[PDB]
Design a binder for this molecule. Structure first.
Ligand SMILES: OC[C@H]1O[C@H](O[C@H]2[C@H](O)[C@H](O)CO[C@]2(O)CO)[C@H](O)[C@@H](O)[C@@H]1O
Ligand SMILES: OC[C@H]1O[C@](O)(CO)[C@@H](O[C@H]2O[C@H](CO)[C@@H](O)[C@H](O)[C@H]2O)[C@@H]1O
Ligand SMILES: [Ca+2]
Ligand SMILES: [Ca+2]
Ligand SMILES: [Mn+2]
Ligand SMILES: [Mn+2]
Lengths: 241, 241
């Protein structure tokens, strides 16, 4: 299809079009990307991801068209600790993507350790909400919580300082304009606190024509819940300037 | 997802979200539901169907909601014979639906001979564009080409006279309104000739919560091509009393 859209105001338990990988599962009409115990508390060493089953036509070589897409979603992070880790990410990748070996912790379940910072060895665009930055294990991170745009590398090509708020839902809008090639990210807490970051990227030279979109989260030795509460996505192929 | 939408202005051969069954396949940016030879001429004894891979959430028992959906599509039929057969149909059935054994010809690849008219043995709603009505074989049809609403049976619960026009595209709009439970069909030719038929049906007593949507067509001894040219679909769960 030239255009595709779907909306999940909430996440009832009987899903049919979601691919669950790792420890992701539905609980209380929301997706718990990372594992939790009996009483609902976050645990260490856990990775989880979800992907919508239908493939998205990001760009078409023959018509020379590129998709204009928009992803809106909201998540909350909760942890008994004040050092919640490691973060959640919205990503776009080849249709057959799977959790790479040893991609837990700071790799957010998106990259393999050996190639985490090798751009020519990956095919993924992700918007990360990173809450852990210890310079010993996450040597690639700026020294503070942040929102980052990741293009084939765990080391963001662009970031903005971010504030983690326990149990507070963050509303996020991600838009890609094929006409300007700008990937814009706008995140806001209910009180109006706003965060913005954008980067120019030619999705055609990064990803195949058909892809899958989803979310990933992980927790290494430090933990927190990564709760996806709602998600809408729309994509339309367009002839650009 | 509560809402799902997709549009195929055309059908490039590079498809990922379509489920092809029988002889259905892409040729010339269009879906040829029934088999055609090297020259593109229709052949006898062929059945074919396509289904969008993503399941549509038609209704939700818990929330007491029922989907509002619209399907807009266009097709053309062509045959050197004076009695091209057998017809094309847009249908809605359970997710695991497959072509029934012996469902060729007049059964449109939708029903098995043994229960083609047993409304308790089937789960399918279809809008058929039936061009073959020979009273000796298709005993269940009115004696003329017609558009029919099929609810669990090849014997339409409602039919209206229709004109078959070789090589001319018919634009069809099929909508369902959960508040009135009206399934409306409006079809037009490029010259303004209009056909419309409506029927009240509670989809919850006929189909399961999750379904797949698609098209089916078949040719028995008589034949014609059944070319699906474009298709857009959308559905949203809504509250009903
Ligand atoms: O495709 C038309 C029609 O073809 C078959 O019906 C034939 C009978 O099998 C018999 O040979 C007498 O002639 C027909 O009625 C017409 O050719 C299929 O059996 C039908 O299902 C189909 O509608
Ligand atoms: O003593 C090293 C030990 O402590 C960290 O640097 C911080 O807890 C550890 O790194 C692990 O845990 C991090 C937080 O969850 C995660 O980001 C790392 O990926 C993971 O290796 C290191 O194990
Ligand atoms: Ca980190
Ligand atoms: Ca017939
Ligand atoms: Mn980071
Ligand atoms: Mn009929």
């Amino acid at each position: 299809q030239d255009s595709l859209s779907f909306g999940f105001p909430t996440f009832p338990s009987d899903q049919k079009n979601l691919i669950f990988q790792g420890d992701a599962q539905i609980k209380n009409n929301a997706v718990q990307l990372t594992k939790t115990d009996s009483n609902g508390n976050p645990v260490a060493s856990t990775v989880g991801r979800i992907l919508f089953s239908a493939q998205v036509h990001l760009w078409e070589k023959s018509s020379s068209r590129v998709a204009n897409f928009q992803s809106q979603f909201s998540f909350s992070l909760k942890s008994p600790l004040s050092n919640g880790a490691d973060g959640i990410a919205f990503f776009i990748a080849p249709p057959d993507t799977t959790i790479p070996s040893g991609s837990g912790g700071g790799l957010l379940g998106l990259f393999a350790p050996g190639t985490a910072q090798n751009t020519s060895a990956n095919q993924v665009i992700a918007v990360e909400f990173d809450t852990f930055y210890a310079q010993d294990s996450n040597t690639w991170d700026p020294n503070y919580p942040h929102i980052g745009i990741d293009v084939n590398s765990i080391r963001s090509v662009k970031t903005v300082k971010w504030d983690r708020r326990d149990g507070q839902s963050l509303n996020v809008l991600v838009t890609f304009n094929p006409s300007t090639r700008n990937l814009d990210v706008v995140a806001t807490y209910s009180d109006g606190t706003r965060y913005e970051v954008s980067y120019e990227v030619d999705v055609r030279s990064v990803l195949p024509e058909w892809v899958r979109v989803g979310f990933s989260a992980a927790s290494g030795e430090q933990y927190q819940t990564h709760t996806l509460e709602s998600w809408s996505f729309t994509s339309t192929l367009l002839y650009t300037a």
